[PDB]
């Protein structure tokens, strides 16, 4: 399709923006959580994808809950005046409304709250992307956020111990081929399709990612 | 595969 | 290839549930202005080509039955299915006789629960305060986990102007994103929320 | 408006 103006997020900025990647692979025994084999591959493929897009990617590893909150709060107090958008990618274990650190569990709503319009004035009216990879078949303060969860609330998200989360693999594939020429929703929709088709109490199963959009404009990674 |  | 196939004799059915008056046991006030909103929704979704049916002052049971019945119908010659819910509400639950979980109203149209709607978009618009089972659903909620003028709601007024002018030329996500903006701007706040598990681009043409 |  086209590229109609007034309806596109203003990308005429000095830099594309920050891209934090939190890569949690090893968890404390007390959590009962296991090594997320394949997550390192997910983080390398993404760092490479978002750098290629024009992001300043920083990759954190085996973070605690205090670390995860602090780094996001600190990231929100930087000056983003010069950035077109912001993006954060969480790779970890999870459960309804919460994501695991290595020491425990913290609600994602508390992590994303740091960037609400009244709490992060330099990102106001700019897109705040959040990608979350964590756990049968057949102006308003919440505008400009967008979440791409790897599965829907309550089901489990799969991950090849040696190929990486399907969501991540698929996303990286789509971004390499079309990241600078498709709008974000078309990309995430294509990712929904990839995950749906291309991938004994745990045998022959499937999974579908969920996209929650509060965006007020179309987001294109170019021009 | 492994889930989370 | 990247759009939902729309080559069908019918666009699809569109159930509009309009709850204005509640039982004194519920303690919800009469929702003034919802009749202006619905009338509009009816003209827009009819313009789009939906077979629209408006049900007034439903109960938890009536709703669960209306949707179970709809899911048990034959959608083979329909492109999609739409359902619009106007009522009072709380987190994860909709409100004349009480409260019903949104998960219950949607489940009926899950893959296995409705083989005749597989691979077709199921749209739910909620205004209030092998292949996978939950894929191809889309929810447009009026606020995040909502204000109404005794002129109609902001969400619905916006949604209707956009659909009137671009329903035939824009993709669903583009439309909904434009609705998100208008609402935000006019807001003089609340921002709608779009949840998409669609696997294709949706054009009503 | 009102509320809801
Ligand atoms: O994804 C979220 C974050 S809510 C939100 C939505 C839009 C904008 C800001 C927020 C914000 O407060 O940061 C969630 C987590 C748990 C529950 Cl119950 C409901 C939503």
Q: Do the Cβ atoms of C150 and D3 come within 8 Å?
A: no
Asked if residue A108 lies in contact with residue A132, where contact means CB atoms within 8 angstroms, the answer is: yes
Decide whether any atom of ligand 1 lies within 6 Å of the A178 Cβ: no
Asked if residue C192 lies in contact with residue C142, where contact means CB atoms within 8 angstroms, the answer is: yes
Asked if residue A124 lies in contact with residue A192, where contact means CB atoms within 8 angstroms, the answer is: no
Asked if residue C97 lies in contact with residue C56, where contact means CB atoms within 8 angstroms, the answer is: no
Question: In Å, what is the CA distance from A27 to each residue of A35, A149, C72?
Answer: 7, 21, 46
Nearest CA, atom 7, ligand 1:
A142
Sheet with A98-100, side-by-side order of all strands? A94-95, A98-100, A105-107
Residues composing chain A: 223
d(CA A17, CA A22): 16
d(CA A165, CA A159): 4
Write out the residue range of the structural domain in which residue C146 sits: 1-205
Asked if residue A138 lies in contact with residue A158, where contact means CB atoms within 8 angstroms, the answer is: no
Nearest to A202 by CA among A148, A135, A149, A152: A135
Packed helices C154-166 and C172-186: angle between N→C axes, nearest 10 degrees: 140
Chain B positions contacting chain A at CB under 8 Å are 1-4
- Long-range pairs for A177-180: beta carbons < 8 A, 24 or more residues apart: A179/A49, A179/A52, A179/A53, A179/A221, A180/A53, A180/A220, A180/A221, A180/A222
Which of ligand 1's atoms lies nearest the C-alpha of C145? 19
Nearest CA, atom 9, ligand 1:
A142
Decide whether any atom of ligand 1 lies within 6 Å of the A139 Cβ: no
The maximal CA–CA distance of chain A, rounded, in angstroms, is: 53
Write the DSSP string, C30-67: P-TTHHHHHHHHHHHHHHHTEEEEEEES--HHHHHHHH
- Point out the catalytic residue in the list A93, A114, A120, A172: A93
What's the number of domains chain C is made of? 1
Which residues are registered as beta bridge partners of A164? A160
Strands C89-90 and C93-94: antiparallel
Asked if residue A20 lies in contact with residue A36, where contact means CB atoms within 8 angstroms, the answer is: no
SS3 category, C159:
helix
Asked if residue A140 lies in contact with residue A215, where contact means CB atoms within 8 angstroms, the answer is: no
- State how far residue A162 is from chain B, nearest Cα, in angstroms: 9
SS3 category, C82:
strand
CB crowding C113-134: b at 16 or more within 10 Å, else e: ebeebbebbbbbbbbbbeebbb
Which residues from chain A sit within 8 angstroms of residue C191, using beta carbons? 140, 142-143, 214
Out of C134, C178, C199, the one facing A152 most closely (by C-beta) is C134
Question: In Å, what is the CA distance from C132 to each residue of A63, A195, A197, A207, C61?
Answer: 33, 10, 9, 6, 28
d(CA A146, CA A141): 13
| Positive or negative: CA dihedral A4, A10, A12, A18 | negative
Q: Do the Cβ atoms of C184 and A139 come within 8 Å?
A: yes
SS3 category, C94:
strand
Which residues from chain A sit within 8 angstroms of residue C178, using beta carbons? 7
Strands C10-18 and C78-86: parallel
Which residues from chain A sit within 8 angstroms of residue B3, using beta carbons? 135, 156-159, 202
Q: Do the Cβ atoms of D1 and C128 come within 8 Å?
A: no
Decide whether any atom of ligand 1 lies within 6 Å of the A118 Cβ: no
Decide whether any atom of ligand 1 lies within 6 Å of the A112 Cβ: yes
Packed helices A39-53 and A166-178: angle between N→C axes, nearest 10 degrees: 20
Q: Where are the alpha helices (DSSP H) in chain A?
A: 39-53, 65-77, 108-113, 166-178, 184-198
Q: Where are the alpha helices (DSSP H) in C49-153?
A: 60-72, 102-107
Is residue A93 annotated as a catalytic residue, yes or no? yes
| Positive or negative: CA dihedral A61, A65, A67, A70 | positive
Decide whether any atom of ligand 1 lies within 6 Å of the A145 Cβ: yes
- Point out the catalytic residue in the list C14, C75, C80, C88: C88
Asked if residue B1 lies in contact with residue A160, where contact means CB atoms within 8 angstroms, the answer is: yes
Chain D positions contacting chain C at CB under 8 Å are 1-4
Burial of A6: CB neighbours in 10 Å, binned 0-12, 13-18, 19+: exposed
Which residues are registered as beta bridge partners of C126? C85, C141
The maximal CA–CA distance of chain C, rounded, in angstroms, is: 52
Q: How many CB atoms lie within 10 A of CB A52?
A: 15
Is residue C60 annotated as a catalytic residue, yes or no? no
């Amino acid at each position: 399709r086209d590229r109609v103006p007034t309806y596109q997020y203003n990308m005429n900025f000095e830099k594309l923006g920050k891209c934090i990647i939190i890569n949690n692979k090893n968890f404390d025994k007390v959590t009962g959580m296991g090594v997320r084999n394949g997550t390192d591959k997910d983080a390398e493929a993404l760092f490479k994808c978002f750098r290629s897009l024009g992001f300043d990617v920083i990759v954190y590893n085996d973070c605690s809950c205090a670390k995860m909150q602090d780094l996001l709060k600190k990231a929100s107090e930087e000056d983003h005046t010069n950035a077109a958008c912001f993006a954060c990618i969480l790779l970890s274990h999870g459960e309804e409304n919460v994501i695991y650190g290595k020491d425990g569990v913290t609600p994602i709503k508390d992590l994303t709250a740091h960037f609400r319009g009244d709490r992060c004035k330099t990102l106001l009216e700019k897109p705040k992307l959040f990608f979350i990879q964590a756990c049968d078949g057949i102006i308003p303060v919440e505008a400009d956020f967008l979440f791409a969860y790897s599965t829907v609330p309550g089901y489990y998200s799969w991950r090849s111990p040696g190929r990486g989360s399907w969501f991540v693999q698929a996303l990286c594939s789509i971004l390499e081929e079309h990241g600078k020429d498709l709008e974000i929703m078309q990309i995430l929709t294509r990712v929904n399709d990839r995950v749906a088709r291309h991938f004994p109490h745990f045998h022959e199963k499937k999974q579908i990612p969920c996209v929650v959009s509060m965006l007020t404009k179309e987001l294109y990674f170019s021009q | 595969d492994e889930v989370x």
